[PDB]
Design a protein around this ligand. Structure first.
Ligand SMILES: C=CC(=O)N1CCC[C@@H](n2nc(-c3ccc(Oc4ccccc4)cc3)c3c(N)ncnc32)C1
Length: 452
């Protein structure tokens, strides 16, 4: 049997994705770079037996399509699954779209064609995505012509969707009604692609609401309109395809394959204005979604840190069998290894070598075990804290330094934080009734919302 750390070494942590953290890794012999999704058997419940998962893995390894992430290898140990595939460097589709001069029906059609083509291919092979959303769409490279790669095909079939809002963020917009009710098939992916197309052409989700449950209610009802002004500058054939994709009864819904043949895909991927309003709305949409996301991740990292800080102090105290408050390099390493032995393996610490290295990074800064803990945990939180500052600066497009109480409502609503609870927290911070918070205030609000 093969061990993952015998073959690969961690380079960078790429981020949190569905069901797990993704690491840029490198083959120890060949120097081949790869992206690895690490799935914690603790945090995620399986829906199928081991035999069925292995069988799916084997098939996925043989499949090949230019719009589908390529899987190379699969590993399993006591506590983890490791899905090893091709690295893509162009980031998420929507992030590229917001940094564009012009965007038209031609651009959207070229995008949708790719998605549909990838989906069609996978449906032929009896694989359903079920969780398709903008963040599942990566661009292959930084190039302007670069292909879209759909990630995560085949995961939702074998793993139960997280119930934590940190993981649920932004899922409600895209889910087909029949997924909510339990009887679903491959048509659910056409629905989600229809929702994505709708957003691409208007910058607004077709089913919206002030919170998660409110969005699900609208989805379940199935009603939506092209009433928004920006739809006036959009072709009738686009709206027609949307209607067919967002058809309530799945048996009456257009297939992925027939969507490829639709008048709209044919004409605009074969004299077209730029949807300026849509670019402006998508930029707002994306900023909103990413700040809400950063906020929840920041709170989680804060809690995780508090938990680990105390545990690490309790390890270094027990190890300090002479009681002086200071320790040697080797002790710190064995202690830090104990922390991951108990609290579970960390993203950037795939093996014993990774921990040794991390300790030395902390020690190179410290120039007293309490001071080691401080810097160590600070380094653990760094990426969530700066993701917060950056998403805050991104959202604050006017560089005003502030976010209004209206904007907060939208942010907390997407974060699914109780309206009465954050208003309460806002009152304690905004004692001046400015109706707005700066970054530090915003950050204090979040600390108060996670028990601090
Ligand atoms: C701005 C945030 C951004 O871009 N993100 C957010 C942070 C993670 C990034 N990410 N993820 C993958 C990837 C890697 C492995 C994988 O496992 C399989 C699951 C099922 C079947 C086969 C493989 C799924 C996705 C990934 C990747 N491959 N390449 C580059 N980034 C990746 C994208």
């Amino acid at each position: 049997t093969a061990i993952f750390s015998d073959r690969y070494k961690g380079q960078r942590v790429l981020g949190k994705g569905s069901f797990g953290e993704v690491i840029l890794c490198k083959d120890k012999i060949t120097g081949q770079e790869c992206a690895v999704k690490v799935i914690s058997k603790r945090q995620v419940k399986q829906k199928t037996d081991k035999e069925s998962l292995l069988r799916e893995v084997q098939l996925l390894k043989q499949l090949d399509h230019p719009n589908i992430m390529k899987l190379y290898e699969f590993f399993e140990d006591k506590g983890y699954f490791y899905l090893v595939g091709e690295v893509y460097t162009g980031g998420e589709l929507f992030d590229e779209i917001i940094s564009r001069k012009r965007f038209s029906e031609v651009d959207a059609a070229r995008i949708i064609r790719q998605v549909l083509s990838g989906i069609t291919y996978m449906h032929k092979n009896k694989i359903v995505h079920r969780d398709l959303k903008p963040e599942n769409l990566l661009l292959e490279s930084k190039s302007k012509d670069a292909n879209i790669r759909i990630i995560d095909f085949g995961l939702s079939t074998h793993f139960e969707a997280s119930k934590k809002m940190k993981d649920k963020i932004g899922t409600a917009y895209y889910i087909a009604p029949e997924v909510l009710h339990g009887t679903y098939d491959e048509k659910c992916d056409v629905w989600s692609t229809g929702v994505i197309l709708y957003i691409l052409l208007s910058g607004c989700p077709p089913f919206n609401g002030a919170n998660e449950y409110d969005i699900l209610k609208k989805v379940e009802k199935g009603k939506y309109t092209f009433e928004l002004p920006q739809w006036k500058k959009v072709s009738e054939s686009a709206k027609d395809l949307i209607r067919k994709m967002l058809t309530y009864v799945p048996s009456m819904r257009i297939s992925a394959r027939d969507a490829l043949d639709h008048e709209w895909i044919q004409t605009y991927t074969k004299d077209v204005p730029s949807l300026d309003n849509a670019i402006l709305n998508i930029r707002q949409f994306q900023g909103t979604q990413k700040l809400a996301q950063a906020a929840l991740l920041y709170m989680g990292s804060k809690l995780t840190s508090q938990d680990e800080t105390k545990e690490l102090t309790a390890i270094f105290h027990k190890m300090d069998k002479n009681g002086d408050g200071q320790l040697d390099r080797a002790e710190l390493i064995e202690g830090y290894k104990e922390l991951m032995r108990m609290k579970g393996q960390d993203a950037s610490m795939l093996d014993a070598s990774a921990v040794e290295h991390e300790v030395d990074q902390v020690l190179d800064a410290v120039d007293e075990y309490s001071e080691f803990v401080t810097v160590a945990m600070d380094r653990k939180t760094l990426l969530s804290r700066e993701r917060l500052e950056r998403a805050f600066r991104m959202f604050d497009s006017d560089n005003s330094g502030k976010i209004s109480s209206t904007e907060l409502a939208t942010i907390f609503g997407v974060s699914d934080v109780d309206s009465e609870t954050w208003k309460s927290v806002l009152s304690e911070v905004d004692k001046n009734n400015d109706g707005e918070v700066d970054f530090d205030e915003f950050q204090q609000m979040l600390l108060k919302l996670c028990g601090n």
